[PDB]
Amino acid sequence: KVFGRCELAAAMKRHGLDNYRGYSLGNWVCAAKFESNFNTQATNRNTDGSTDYGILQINSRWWCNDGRTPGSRNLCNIPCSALLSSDITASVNCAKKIVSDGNGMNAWVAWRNRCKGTDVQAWIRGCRL
Ligand SMILES: [Cl-]
Ligand code: NA
């Protein structure tokens, strides 16, 4: 599923992302836009053999199992495929774990390079929230 900007913001707000660990909603929408272009089915293979999955591009090296990332962990306890669903619940629940692990949203490379230090509130402006 390809989310609309406002549609996704309302979805994320409902799942408890707004201000989660101090990150305003706009930060999450910004990250999702640049990581996956709001596409739940986005996948991208990395040099190390791991793959990033879903709207928040969560990595198979640590977070989910895809059966093809040798010596990897499954800290979210889920198959990576579950991160590609039209329902973002699995991605949200797992992202909450990632952002709580000490490095905050810096774990998302696109957020650090394209959202951090910007007017991220602009991503939810005009939305009925
Ligand atoms: Cl933080
Ligand atoms: Na894994």
From Swiss-Prot:
One of its GO terms (molecular function) is identical protein binding. Its EC number is 3.2.1.17. It is found in: Secreted. Residues 1-129 form the C-type lysozyme domain. It comes from the Eukaryota. In the egg white and polymorphonuclear leukocytes. Keywords: Allergen, Antimicrobial, Bacteriolytic enzyme, Disulfide bond, Glycosidase, Hydrolase, Secreted, Signal. Belongs to the glycosyl hydrolase 22 family. Lysozyme C is capable of both hydrolysis and transglycosylation; it also shows a slight esterase activity. It acts rapidly on both peptide-substituted and unsubstituted peptidoglycan, and slowly on chitin oligosaccharides. Monomer. Lysozymes have primarily a bacteriolytic function; those in tissues and body fluids are associated with the monocyte-macrophage system and enhance the activity of immunoagents. Has bacteriolytic activity against M.luteus. This is Lysozyme C.
